Design a protein around this ligand. Sequence first.
Ligand code: CLA
Ligand code: CLA
Ligand code: CLA
Ligand code: ZEX
Ligand code: ZEX
Ligand code: PQN
Lengths: 59, 38, 175, 83, 170, 741
Amino acid sequence: MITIPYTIPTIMVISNLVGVAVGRYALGRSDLTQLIASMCFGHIIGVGIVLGLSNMGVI
Amino acid sequence: MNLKKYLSTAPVVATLWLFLTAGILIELNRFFPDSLFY
Amino acid sequence: PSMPFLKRPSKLDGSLPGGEGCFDPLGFTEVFSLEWLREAEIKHCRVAMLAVLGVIAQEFGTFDFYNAKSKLQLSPDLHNQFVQNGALQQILLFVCAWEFIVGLPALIESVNGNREPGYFGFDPLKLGGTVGSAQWKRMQAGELRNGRLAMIAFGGFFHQQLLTKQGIIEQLAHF
Amino acid sequence: YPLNPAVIFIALIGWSAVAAIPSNIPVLGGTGLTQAFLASIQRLLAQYPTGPKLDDPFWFYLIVYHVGLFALLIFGQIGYAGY
Amino acid sequence: VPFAPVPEAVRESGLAGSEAEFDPLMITSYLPISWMRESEVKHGRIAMLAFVGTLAQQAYQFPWYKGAPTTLVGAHDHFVTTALAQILLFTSAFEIVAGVPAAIQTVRGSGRLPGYYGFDPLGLWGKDEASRKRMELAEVKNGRLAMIAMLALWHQEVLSGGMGVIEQLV
Amino acid sequence: QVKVVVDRDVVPTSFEKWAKPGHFSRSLAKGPKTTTWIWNLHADAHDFDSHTSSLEEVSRKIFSAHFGQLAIIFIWLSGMYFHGARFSNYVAWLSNPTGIKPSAQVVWPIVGQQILNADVGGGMQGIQITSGLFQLWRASGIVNELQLYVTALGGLGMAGLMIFAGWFHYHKAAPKLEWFQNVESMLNHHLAGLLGLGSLSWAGHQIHVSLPINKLLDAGVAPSSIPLPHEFILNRNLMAELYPSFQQGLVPFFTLNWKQYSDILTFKGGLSPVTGGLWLTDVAHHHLAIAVLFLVAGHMYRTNWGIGHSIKQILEAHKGPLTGEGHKGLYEILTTSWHANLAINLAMLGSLSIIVAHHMYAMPPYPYLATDYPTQLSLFTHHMWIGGFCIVGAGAHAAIYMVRDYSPTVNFNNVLDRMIRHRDAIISHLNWVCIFLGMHSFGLYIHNDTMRALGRAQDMFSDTAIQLQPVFAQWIQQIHTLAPGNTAVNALATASYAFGADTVTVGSKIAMMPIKLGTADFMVHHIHAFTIHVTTLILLKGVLYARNSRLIPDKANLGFRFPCDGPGRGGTCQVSAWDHVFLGLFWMYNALSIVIFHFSWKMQSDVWGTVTSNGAISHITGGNFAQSAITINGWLRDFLWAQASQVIQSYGSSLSAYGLMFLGAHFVWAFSLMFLFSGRGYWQELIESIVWAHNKLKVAPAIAPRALSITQGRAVGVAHYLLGGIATTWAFFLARIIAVG
Ligand code: CLA
Ligand code: CLA
Ligand code: CLA
Ligand SMILES: CC1=C(/C=C/C(C)=C/C=C/C(C)=C/C=C/C=C(C)/C=C/C=C(C)/C=C/C2=C[C@H](C)[C@H](O)CC2(C)C)C(C)(C)C[C@@H](O)C1
Ligand SMILES: CC1=C(/C=C/C(C)=C/C=C/C(C)=C/C=C/C=C(C)/C=C/C=C(C)/C=C/C2=C[C@H](C)[C@H](O)CC2(C)C)C(C)(C)C[C@@H](O)C1
Ligand SMILES: CC1=C(C/C=C(\C)CCC[C@H](C)CCC[C@H](C)CCCC(C)C)C(=O)c2ccccc2C1=O
């Protein structure tokens, strides 16, 4: 985990932002559980992307 | 009070008694094993 | 609250001999009916006072004819010098009388709620054996507290083994 | 009950083209998933009694092709549930 | 519009102390404030006493068995094995008989300030007034200030080379 | 919504109602004017859905009874850990597992039975374990006897927590029905909390206990230089030498550099050729996969936070056109009746237990498990039979739901009763499949039987004769040979050695050999398809005709355990939904008797046995399956006669108790038949003709001595048919393979 130039935290926050974009669509109330649920989902998508980008291919 | 009435039922008395006669035979067959006489 | 503690005002107790207060932080007297636990407390405190006076009085160095102690724990030399004498078998067996003969129906008196669940009679004393109000409660608290300190203090009297492997008198000869 | 038996062929492009251009090399198909089958049927098509149980790129890409093709045409009939 | 945040009101005003009502994430709206207020207080405690534990980490008279593990990770390497598993134990056994009825009894619904009323040879604390709540509010502000100070004192060494605290000012 | 609403101080805990046997049923507290009150005291003792219709009081009773079951299970497991501690040769077994036969139970020395104490090595004798506990303990990493005493002590402690638990949840804190029908939370805590944290924390045990210990035992270190499991966690330096990935800490975990944990966790498969079991790196990695995958799986049920599903909005959305209404109704079916949930959970539990059996022969997961073949055998066999019986309970409790708790108002046009609208077309095609498979699964055996008997062995279905090589099983088995390079890309070896490469020899004993399936194994698979379809015929006939058959159009009015209707309709004996369960237990004994007879004879001919030098092969029967499974004279001669030789010659030796559990279990088997064939209209006045001989001597019993009832008098015939018939195969199996393995 290194800084702003392209690495693992670069490609987690985009998955978390599209995850909370899904939370705006999947029962899109602006409460806490949009964040705790939907940042968690984009966190799952993020971890599924990161090592999948690490196994078959350059990161 | 009613616990002894549970201990007076059919299976509980039958196990406290057949456990006892089974203990008579098992303890009487360690002490006197191979008793074919008498 | 009724407790001199955080908070639980008189969960089920409050008139028992806690002279400093009723302690009871965890839910045992919630559901255990408290007479069972009182008979267990008093019986454990009696036998623990016997335990701690056993350890100390044996650590004043007395044997009819046996080995050097070096400990009052660690089973073979002490305990299975005694068992191989054929000797502790009866000192268990008479207590096997005592609990089944005069402790079990005593515990049935701890079933119905008609006992004050200590009370194996037994005051061979004149001028101080009050069965009534004052000295019975304030002396029963003495048996209770000295029995509890006998429980923990016997806990430490057991557990001084790893860095010690010696007597507790030899622990007093160490720092 | 079969109210809309409209088209079938849309599943075919819907299942060949989603598996042709992904190569995913180190498996049986060093090429794509469907090229390793359509390339491996024209060797056997002109009346060949070969193709034993060790014939990997034919027999395996029979089941692994048809088990997605069946599912995607069934979901093609689910593509007439919103009608 | 509760006086800290953006213009978005907060439902909570029901006897928590520290009247700022800082709820951006509305965790209050899904968890009761007796539990969480006992966590604010209870983390505040370890923030206090661990902060001055680090102030007394390199200080005067010790129990005198050391001189090498003056660091913090090295303290958690040396002491955890022998000398600190009872620092775990004597507050574990305190916690299972003190904090378990405290937090579980407040979240069950017993009316009690989550500070678990205790030893008090000091404090004004005889006048049932705001000065009690002034020491509550000063207590929690000193607690979170000590807490932020604990990430300071954790991050004053990891990005500085495992060094001390007062030696950084040189 | 979700909340916890629990009644406190519900039922007093006196001993008063113990003095009233049959207090529980108002149809049964009349007192025994007959002896049938006695037996109905026990069959109604757990009709919790038949004491009172109030689902709250029922549900309190069952949920408190579960803790009684777990109390008996913790008494049982604490028994196994204490018999491993005090009585077993486990510390001696841990020295050389391939030589010392495992034994715990040391028979008390009374007349003769000291001969049952088998000299199994380890300097101590006793009757040999076939349950395979020691292989579970070496995998667990239990080093010396102290962890077995301590874990038995904790087994008693958890048994006390379950006794006090169920006591606490029936009497003095018992929940409402609103607590019980919170099923999104029940799945939400079992998928995550039970199974998820169970597999995750077990991955913690395997990584921080079993991987260092079963690396040290894989090196061959005696259990004295092995440190405590304990002593691996105080410092990583005792594990960084064993696995250098522990030196990096959890930093490669949180930075997602999970390449670094290739030492601890991997995907190899196959079998470790030193220990003969799975690689515990693969097994710990495996439980992390169940961990993350089940903990993800738990969070699909909305409970309080409006995030997740409910079961209702899932089931109502599957409103497919061939069913019409869709699954509208099943969430009210499965949250009001317990027998329906018991049907589903028993079906999936039993079929999981069969899956357990197969995955324990072919991927032996414990070290030195496939080297002592009885523990390899019977752990297959035993999880088959509970794997069997729990299916029939499905066919029991799907029947009972159709009889007792069925309700056509809530259940109108959905997926459920639209089956019952064409249950003739269900049972009729099960009927056709049963006859087609019976001809083509057993007529092949009569065929090869006659063709071998008529001399024309060219006209058989042998290898050399008309071959019936199972094409599909050999093909997908070859796909599993081609697994670890092609499709399981990051694998190294195959999923098992029941599929692919050369066999695994561990201490001159064959761990797993690639099973060849040719033209006899085909026909035994069609046996299994056949006898699975017959039990599916009887147990779907017992559910679809549970309530209103076209023979008897009121079975819901008669009940579930009614015997019959009468001699009308030409006789309607044995017609209830219970009676199909009665028949499904016999066919259970058939279907699993030939599952294990297929097992224990193909894997004494094609897998097990020993090896000699230069890689030579020697099975126990010596390849004597494919030339001999095709007939029945070959079956009955070469298996049930030839394999008896180590059971029948067992007198005077330590296997002789099996020689007693072989004969007597024949007895009980045949003793079942007296209850099956006769009926209570004979026994009732045979008995009453004996009641004359008691009335003559004033020894008239006050409880009037009836015969057994009909459903009892047949239920006891099943329950002796299975104890006798199962214990024959039990003593035959364990007496067979202990004399070899
Ligand atoms: C994540 C929490 C959790 C866990 C671990 C369990 C675990 C279990 N539940 Mg359960 N349950 C839960 C939440 C949980 N439940 C919730 C929230 C509900 C309400 C919807 C239910 C409702 C429920 C019913 C209705 C039944 C169970 C049953 C069972 C047992 C299945 C038997 C088994 O697998 O044996 C394996 C055994 C174990 C792994 C032993 C685990 C025991 C330890 C001590 C963990 C238990 C935690 C416990 C809940 C703590 C109580 C909290 C209290 C002190 C405040 C198993 C013990 C069944 C059963 O047999 O009853 C007991 C049953 O009939 N549960
Ligand atoms: C060895 C004894 C035996 C045999 C052969 C059968 C056979 C059968 N039972 Mg069964 N059954 C038995 C014992 C037996 N049962 C017992 C003990 C119970 C007690 C629980 C049951 C309970 C039971 C139930 C509850 C059911 C069956 C059913 C069936 C039929 C299944 C369909 C099938 O296999 O067709 C194939 C036929 C055979 C395999 C028999 C051999 C026929 C050979 C292969 C061919 C014919 C021989 C020859 C050519 C005949 C012509 C020559 C001759 C005229 C001279 C089958 C006829 C089911 C049924 O009735 O419908 C499906 C059913 O529901 N049985
Ligand atoms: C049911 C199992 C079974 C099967 C498959 C066979 C098969 C066979 N037996 Mg046989 N046999 C059996 C049971 C069986 N046997 C039993 C149980 C006995 C003892 C009672 C015998 C005793 C026996 C003897 C004594 C002999 C045989 C022989 C033979 C062979 C030739 C018979 C023949 O002409 O077929 C007759 C076949 C038909 C008349 C055709 C009917 C079946 C067709 C294919 C069904 C098709 C339906 C179709 C799929 C419907 C869908 C299509 C539609 C929708 C359009 C053949 C391999 C003979 C031999 O020499 O072996 C080589 C021989 O001498 N058998
Ligand atoms: C010797 C004997 C055996 C051994 C038997 C041992 C002796 C069994 C008995 C063990 C008991 C005696 C140990 C008990 C220890 C007590 C534990 C450690 C807790 C102690 C303190 C608790 C009570 C906390 C107390 C807080 C103290 C704190 C300061 C506050 O004020 C609050 C308060 C009071 C709650 C064998 C098995 C070893 C071998 C045999 O042959 C013989
Ligand atoms: C009462 C009864 C009888 C009497 C029965 C007995 C004889 C009464 C005596 C009871 C005694 C045994 C009470 C015991 C009390 C608890 C003892 C004293 C514990 C002491 C431990 C203290 C000293 C702390 C010890 C730290 C323990 C710690 C582990 C370190 O190592 C250091 C160390 C040693 C300081 C009669 C017959 C006499 C009279 C009758 O009327 C009734
Ligand atoms: C034998 C038989 C009986 C008779 C079985 C009798 C009635 C039961 C015999 C066993 C009982 C339990 C014996 C009673 C003994 C008591 C337990 C007391 C004895 C003392 C000790 C054993 C406790 C039937 O009632 C019956 C009914 C329907 C179909 C077949 C049959 C059937 O085959």
